[model samples]
Target chain A: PDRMLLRDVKALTLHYDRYTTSRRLDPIPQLKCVGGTAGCDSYTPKVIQCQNKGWDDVQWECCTDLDIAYKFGKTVVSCEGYESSEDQYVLRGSCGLEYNLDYTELGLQKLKESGKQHGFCSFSDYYYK
Target chain B: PDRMLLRDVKALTLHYDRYTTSRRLDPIPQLKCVGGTAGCDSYTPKVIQCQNKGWDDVQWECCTDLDIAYKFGKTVVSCEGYESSEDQYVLRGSCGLEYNLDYTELGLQKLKESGKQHGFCSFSDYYYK
Candidate 1:
């Protein structure tokens, strides 16, 4: 994105409310969520993001992915950004769970029991600058 | 995570507007987003989710990440799911850009230009099940 200008509540609001609705911190589409093991360093995966150029080179998009997820439990990185620093405020809280069990009989049971387990998610409307 | 239990607008509202505010569809936080290239086949990332065991086994979290993002220009998978199919709705639209340039002079220009380029995101209050 080019920029979000000052007092641009629309853009900031859009990101917090809409842009991230369906999207969550999932492995960059190709990397697998490996078990808590020690050999992942053999892979040392990285992410792609847009980077800058030198005084006379070409600026380009680069990877910004990581490899800690395989080591710790989940991945942690800041989300995308707008044009300015002042307007950037990413909200957080409530650890999420991605259990295939959400669809199986247990998912059904969890559904019936509802709000009684550890993997359940409950989000909020707060953010940080 | 026990359950959303419907009438549960709080939990649902938290994700789209807050939980995901700073989190985009990043590669499970560990998987990288390979460019439009090949040879990536050497690695097939798979996200882990929870799975259930029937009869006499154990029900645990499993993986659900994908491998197509590496093969395809980008990955396209549905967002996470809620307890009740009836209350789940993930909103979408507006392509996002991850330019490290957002901090460079060009980013400053974008800040001035504001809402005048691509990869710029403007979200909404709509969602679908």
Candidate 2:
């Protein structure tokens, strides 16, 4: 395969499960966290920050998000894991979502909330994507 | 607040559900997509490429990954989706992973894969993170 290292374009050539396919509504002055109450780590996009403990560890930041999920989910796998065996899978999320985090109490208040998501599958393992 | 608009760190100040969390193993010269067959959009990190339709269309390269999901997995908001109600919600992922894509067939063959994924969550809606 010395012709070339076609990792980039090669990845795009597909018709299987997609890693991501959602309709983003309008742009926000500030991108709020899109909380998926339906569950799972449905990461949509937002401004994020990271820091080190020890206060003296030096607080640095990077771009990332937050999500939620439970267990390994399906013990058995199906075609793209469609329709949950546990909760009845079907694929749901937000084309447009709005949410907020209570910095005061440091609480998560899902102020808002997708459907029609299928891939040739999508990307993940939370991070180990 | 005409306060220089601190985007990066201001976003990281609080503790909330993170967008990306997991143990990333050693890096491969070539990064593979981490697949979560469990059923959620858990985007981590990877080298991605994008293209447009038509031979006249444009083809571009990017650094992105794909994921998998099933129907809306839960309801009745809970704190940091822990343990499973349907399958029992808990955190599960690969700390170290190994995956590959069949450029020959252009298929995401999840050759390998995270765990200990939680957040204060991780990042999302795909490019829409």
Candidate 3:
């Protein structure tokens, strides 16, 4: 079978409120990265922003297809003062989960259950090949 | 009675969900900067972030009080790349309104009615010294 691409995954739309009392509405489209090969770091991801429909309260569709490949390992990056790198890289294959409600609740629950301020999980561990 | 300072205004709690699938939960507190002088730009404002509540799903309250004064003017800032200073400042006096629901809806309505992509308004313009 041919290798699956990140663009094949489903896309979700996100809406952001105005920063201040201003009446500007910003829309962000989210792409769910799904199952992929075990090790594919050479792939490059593409991120784009488009306005499919004109500015109306009406529903608009925006899509961002990514061609980048992620790896399959975990590495922590430090963010202390200066001498530390500011980014971390982790790779795992899995299906993306879309929550109908704000995901903040799930995050808070995870933190409380683990007694940790921060953490993460992957869906590939359960449903990926 | 002496003039009321915005720093005296009460603060509220805000929480942010993890960006990725990681188990980290970030907390942000919202402050209601209440009544203040009509033209107080001469007053310096302070913005700070503190971790008062330790890492737990337990409620955490973060406070950011402002001392800086604001003036009364409506000058638009331009973001047209090189020619723009990239910032605008407006001033008005009134009690700050804190919303339990995401304020995004209000902004969207303002945009839809005006048919403008973005805009803003001041509360003090309603009631104040």
Candidate 4:
């Protein structure tokens, strides 16, 4: 397989209103990379670091109860429990959507690019109120 | 060390308007638990499962380019890049904040609890506009 190279990635961040319902907006706390092959059932172990807003310190845990949405080739596998109440949260699952690279490389690169402007493409949602 | 038992955990989800700055709200895509011992520097590898709002399929990846905030004992670790532009995304890092448990158990419990009412506590921020 050819090595996957992610370039010119951009991210669009927005704040949205909460849905009209009695349900509260409970989001999964944090997400981190373990390790695994491209099409494997399991992954390598890793810690999930997270913190609440306006907090200074980082929380390093053996596990974090955060949901994840990622892409393998063209198949998108979105885990349960990772949702936001304010606005929609989106990210680039795969760099090229063709070659699958190491999880750490792919995940870290996406994180770095998320900090930059236009790090990833934007998708509109009609659910926003 | 005593084994950590998480019970009655809760999560509060909300939606807030975006800030009045040029900064766009680009959230970290996904988060997962790899594996590791508490108080250790490294962690085991895991996958983060996530989906955008109004989407049906789940997106799974080796590495999710998302930020994480976790807690170790009393110290909180807010990893870089895990912020939401809509409302504040929050979750329970540690169950009791006294004993630590396996990342998977802690995280999975958090995810499950987050789905239920009063899964975790909620906090407010002044940055919301």
Candidate 5:
């Protein structure tokens, strides 16, 4: 029997209207894993702050139940002011079937570890300014 | 040519953890339409307040960007304290390929009119207490 019950991560087509490129892109056209289970020991989807190539960057896998994000080991960070540019990231790799379809606390810990090397379903977090 | 892009509405699996009934049941096994475009003249999904069988009830189809909702032709209403109970509502029927595949202001007007009779896609908008 397979775990995860199908709703932990969803295959969805999300249109980000905030970006100019989105309008021209024709509504993303394909289904990508998005959204997450809320409540019952579920971790709210958040962005992780990490350094890549000597540049300060942030990584968000998927979901959006909480306002605050994470800064790796340091702790919490704000996601309010930063809402500008974003790159396409794999939902399955970060939150979907990847990592062996796990959505538990330990599963998220794996995602955090993956974020450090810019691995598996990671997106760039840029500020609008 | 198919008018509305695939991204306008998506077939997705959504899990609701707030309800005991949801946890026991499979994670909304079927694909349902959910989420919407959030920019460039797109209407943020909201709930409508209407009276059914002489009882005050609310109807919300799908999507969530803004924090407010509507009340048919009367005015705007608050959705802050009403996050407790919710029933299954059709996302495709409400926002999917229905209404002749339109998401414009005029299209939503049709949903409002349909909401009066609990037509198209509609959900019970119950207050959490």
Candidate 6:
């Protein structure tokens, strides 16, 4: 496996399968090392990082609090998650796909610590809006 | 004026005056060139960038779509902006202070074009969650 820094790679705009009624699809957020053998991808404003072996092979890894993982793709699609009701934090994909994340304190903490030091923001402060 | 790339600077966690009913205060997002003689500050996930001459001397500058400007400080405090009501896009500061931004197409477009190419993200993708 060839190792390279995400900052040194090129950024490509990613497409999404889900969007709210008013989100802009064109000129959306971009990511690096996606869709190739390097296989690293991420959605703006999420706590999850994607690492894949190939185009179809991917897994969302926990980088921080899983409770905010859903925000990664959802925020870019639409500003979701301002509800007062309870929310079940789950892993979401760039293509509107979803996955159940087993909420375990020790396990989650372990993953969080490992990927916490990574110094990359999915999108600029502009997109966070 | 000293102009240096944001990527080459240090990041420091900023404090907030407002927060939702539930949000983590500690270990929040960090920013560069904040609270000093340089006077450059930004809240995570907002379309506005701050530039100040000194402490308490600050003005939030438009970087992109003003509609998303509200997300910067609010998202850091709590998950806001998921409402269906009409949103009055305005400028927000690193503190809880707010300002009214006059909407103008020609002027906004000018600012957008000027700052659009800035290659910096306020916080890591992890903090976006």
lDDT of 3 by residue, A52-106 (tens): 2322211223333321112212211111111112212111121111111111333
Report the alpha-carbon TM-score of model 6 versus the true structure.
0.15
For model 1, the stretches where C-alpha displacement exceeds 4 angstroms are A4-40, A45-72, A79-86, A89-129, B1-129
Best by lDDT: 6
Candidate 5 per-residue lDDT over residues A1-129, each given as its tens digit: 111211222332222222111221232311122334222233322221111111122322322223222111112111111122242221222221101012345435534533221111101111100
Q: For model 1, how does the per-residue alpha-carbon lDDT over B55-88 read when each residue is reduced to its tens digit?
A: 1212222223232222223332223223222323
- On residues B47-126, what C-alpha lDDT tens digit does candidate 6 reach at each position? 23333222121222323233322212212211112221122221222122232233234434433533221121111222
TM agreement with the true structure for every prediction: 0.13, 0.13, 0.14, 0.14, 0.14, 0.15
Tens-place lDDT digits, model 4, residues A18-127? 11111223232122222333333443212221222322321111212221322222111121111322222222221110112133344545445433211111121111
Per-residue CA lDDT of model 2 for B29-58, tens digit only, reads 223333333322343334322221222211
For residue A88, give model 6's deviation from the true position in Å: 45
For residue B115, give model 5's deviation from the true position in Å. Answer: 40
lDDT of 5 by residue, B1-129 (tens): 212221222332222222111221222312122333223233322221122111123322322223222211212111111122232222222221111112335334534543121111111111100
Docking tier of model 2: it is incorrect
Clashing pairs for model 5 are none
Question: What is the Cα-based lDDT of residue B2 in candidate 2?
Answer: 13
Candidate 4, residue A112: the lDDT equals 57
RMSD of 4: 28.7
Off by over 4 Å in 6: A1-129, B1-47, B55-94, B105-129
Relative to the true structure, candidate 5 reaches a TM of: 0.14
Model 4 TM-score on a 0 to 1 scale: 0.14
For every candidate, the chain B TM-score is 0.18, 0.15, 0.19, 0.17, 0.17, 0.20
